[PDB]
Design a protein around this ligand. Structure first.
Ligand SMILES: Cc1cc2nc3c(=O)[nH]c(=O)nc-3n(C[C@H](O)[C@@H](O)[C@@H](O)COP(=O)(O)OP(=O)(O)OC[C@H]3O[C@@H](n4cnc5c(N)ncnc54)[C@H](O)[C@@H]3O)c2cc1C
Ligand code: HEC
Ligand code: HEC
Ligand code: HEC
Ligand code: HEC
Length: 560
């Protein structure tokens, strides 16, 4: 393993700050500083390559040591989701074993009394979009902030986002001639979530839309290309120019503005217990390399994201999903909830679990809803349609599940490809089948040519504005410019709509006293209420930025 190959050279000293060994802090800044000093940084190594592991869509600081492990085998972090078969020096298999947030309780207790190490104003749990947005906001005229992330790299699921951040009205919307109104945000969001959404929450998720999309803009962002996500009316899923993805883009812009103000960001740092006055007093952090430690603070923003990804838990509410795959990064396992629950927080809609209908088994990645949005039709194993491709995710997941072999085929054109740049990525991953004709496409896919062609030529007729098969309301493009493409997709656990109970101010309410537990804040996928029982495409990112801002600001007034 790497540190032995380097022990052979000059010592412990090479990397560690001292000759005895040991890490100073959990971000591992010294050591990574030593990596770069003899090997160069990522740009340098990226430039040197001919798909390289040293240059990717990942956002924020990506330590060398997140893959190049000192005292143990090393693994590309890319293998959490892809199977690139990189040949990593000192290689190993990617493996994560979920460990309870409460186990090693003696140790945690032994460690809570054992001093008091640092004190800050406001602690933020997690570095996706809700956590960084809170960082900007707490920090931005207010307090001191210490943000902890347990992964070795930042941005959670936020950074994988593909399809857009919903916004209403006054976004750049003006500029494209897209006519839209606030109440039409609320109203499709109540419709989408089957009318149980907390109405006050959906309201602020409507009424702050525009400013969250202006905020991002005050910061360096690019929210100007707009599309159609399943379930809304007037077009409104904001994204970067020409069909790229908002996630990475938003994460990155929030990471830099968070780092640019004075946030104290720390990776390899899991919050495992909120500190009990019962007013929140601090937090119990297990730094992966520095051990346990207390942070005293006056406000705790919980922004830990969802639990999709923990198949043990998801299978506990909806065992249909047992064994299913997830579209999430490896950190969305429910830690956050557990920490909050321990602190006596109330929750709601924990059982409504969103499965994304078009995940790719072969690539280990979700394939954006925008591919259907821009014109793709979906086809079963027989060669025919079976659904209104822009329906709600739950109905779309269900119909593919009810099909010959449990999977289905996205089929689109050269015209749909051109028009949605996320498609270049799928092409880059080698997961896209290509036909010079539909007959050619059929052979690759193993679906029958006459039947698929008849399907496509009929779908074209529907395209003539009427889908006399399945009612699809929008028929954007015809599907007639060669070459023609296909990808088999299937449903995968994606988002957990439920979670902690919070108000419009981001406060968390106690189960027992049905009022706020003091100084306890929360924002993002870890909360419940915003999406009722079904989340609309593009409402996650809008929820997270709006609600992070509110959670950061609320927490700063607290302590002030
Ligand atoms: C593949 C994919 C595509 C999606 N695309 C879109 C889209 O295009 N538009 C849209 O609106 N929505 C989209 N969604 C939904 C959107 O991504 C939200 O679900 C996601 O942004 C959640 O934001 P968050 O801040 O709550 O959490 P995350 O981004 O998950 O950030 C989470 C931080 O907490 C860290 N953490 C967890 N527990 C602890 C702990 N105990 N201590 C320390 N750190 C901890 C986690 O590792 C995590 O990084 C997408 C989701 C996925 C997975
Ligand atoms: C200078 C004193 C170094 C520091 C600090 C680190 N590394 Fe290193 N590394 C160094 C040398 C001179 C070599 C040898 C080349 C040879 O052919 O013998 C290496 C080797 C590696 C490798 C190579 C595996 C291989 O393909 O042969 C890797 C992946 C590597 N080093 C990574 C690495 C990391 C992650 C470090 C930070 C902890 C780091 N090195 C420190 C010199 C020095
Ligand atoms: C995971 C995404 C990685 C991160 C972050 C870093 N490295 Fe890397 N490194 C990784 C792989 C999978 C490989 C080898 C396989 C391949 O096909 O590239 C490497 C290779 C190296 C090497 C040897 C090759 C070379 O060009 O010298 C070195 C010295 C090295 N890596 C060092 C290094 C440093 C200094 C990093 C921080 C900037 C770093 N790696 C990040 C995987 C990943
Ligand atoms: C799970 C959290 C991932 C990790 C870790 C890495 N990638 Fe990824 N990657 C993931 C998704 C969900 C997507 C598709 C997004 C979309 O627009 O639908 C991707 C995309 C790619 C691509 C193609 C598109 C592009 O932007 O080039 C490549 C080449 C790719 N990913 C490679 C890659 C590497 C080298 C990684 C290690 C640094 C890596 N990914 C991490 C999911 C996840
Ligand atoms: C660079 C290649 C290293 C050398 C030569 C040594 N270590 Fe060492 N160390 C390195 C890294 C990247 C880490 C972080 C975690 C990981 O395993 O990747 C560490 C961490 C440690 C520890 C903590 C143990 C743990 O919980 O994993 C110790 C005790 C430590 N480092 C000591 C140490 C000693 C005594 C060394 C001399 C032989 C030494 N390390 C070499 C990177 C490197």
């Amino acid at each position: 393993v790497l540190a032995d190959f380097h022990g052979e050279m000059g010592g412990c000293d090479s990397c560690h700050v001292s000759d005895k060994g040991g890490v100073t802090n959990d971000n591992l800044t010294h050591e990574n500083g030593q990596c770069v000093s003899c090997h160069g940084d990522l740009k340098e190594l990226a430039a040197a390559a001919p798909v390289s592991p040293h240059k990717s869509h990942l956002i924020g600081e990506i330590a060398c040591t997140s893959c190049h492990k000192g005292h143990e085998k090393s693994v590309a972090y890319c293998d959490a989701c892809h199977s690139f078969g990189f040949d990593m020096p000192f290689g190993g298999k990617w493996e994560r074993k979920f460990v309870p947030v409460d186990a090693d309780k003696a140790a945690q207790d032994k460690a809570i009394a054992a001093g008091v190490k640092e004190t800050t104003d406001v602690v933020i749990i997690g570095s996706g979009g809700a956590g960084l947005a809170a960082a900007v906001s707490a920090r931005d005229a207010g307090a001191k902030v210490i943000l902890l992330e347990k992964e070795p790299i930042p941005g959670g699921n936020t950074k994988l986002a593909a399809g857009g951040m919903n916004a209403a009205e006054t976004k750049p919307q003006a500029k494209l001639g897209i006519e839209d109104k606030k109440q039409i945000m609320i109203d499709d969001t109540m419709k989408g979530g089957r009318n149980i959404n907390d109405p006050e929450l959906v309201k602020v998720l409507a009424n702050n839309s525009s400013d969250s999309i202006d905020w991002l803009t005050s910061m360096g962002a690019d929210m100007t290309d707009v599309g159609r996500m399943g379930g809304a009316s007037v077009n409104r899923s904001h994204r970067p120019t020409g069909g790229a993805g908002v996630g990475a883009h938003v994460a990155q812009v929030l990471w830099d503005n968070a780092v640019k103000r004075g946030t104290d960001i720390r990776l390899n740092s899991r919050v495992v217990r909120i500190l009990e006055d019962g007013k929140v007093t601090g937090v119990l952090v297990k730094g992966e390399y520095t051990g346990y430690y207390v942070i005293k603070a006056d406000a705790v923003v919980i922004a830990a994201g969802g639990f999709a990804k923990n198949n043990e838990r998801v299978s506990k509410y909806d065992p249909k999903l047992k064994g299913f795959k997830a579209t999430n990064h490896p950190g969305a396992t429910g830690d956050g909830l557990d920490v909050a629950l321990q602190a006596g927080a109330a929750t709601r809609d924990l059982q409504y679990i969103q499965a994304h209908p078009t995940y790719s088994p072969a690539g280990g990645v979700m394939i954006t809803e925008a591919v259907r949005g821009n014109g793709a039709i979906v086809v079963n194993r027989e060669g025919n349609r079976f659904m209104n491709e822009i329906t709600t995710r739950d109905k779309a997941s269900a119909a593919i599940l009810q099909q010959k072999g449990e999977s289905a085929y996205l089929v689109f054109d050269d015209s749909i490809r051109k028009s949605l740049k996320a498609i270049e990525g799928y092409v880059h991953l080698n997961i896209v089948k290509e036909g010079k004709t539909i007959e050619e496409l059929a052979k690759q896919i193993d679906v029958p040519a006459a039947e698929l062609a008849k399907t496509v030529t009929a779908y074209n007729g529907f395209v003539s504005g009427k889908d006399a098969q399945f009612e699809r309301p929008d028929l954007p493009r015809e599907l007639v410019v060669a070459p023609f493409y296909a990808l088999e997709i299937a449903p995968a656990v994606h988002h957990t709509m439920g979670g902690l109970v919070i108000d419009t101010k981001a406060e968390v309410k106690s189960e027992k006293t049905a009022k706020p537990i003091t100084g306890l804040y929360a924002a993002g996928e870890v909360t419940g209420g915003v999406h009722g029982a079904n989340r609309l495409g593009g409402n996650a990112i809008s929820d997270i930025v709006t609600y992070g801002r509110i959670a950061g600001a609320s927490a700063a007034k607290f302590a002030k």
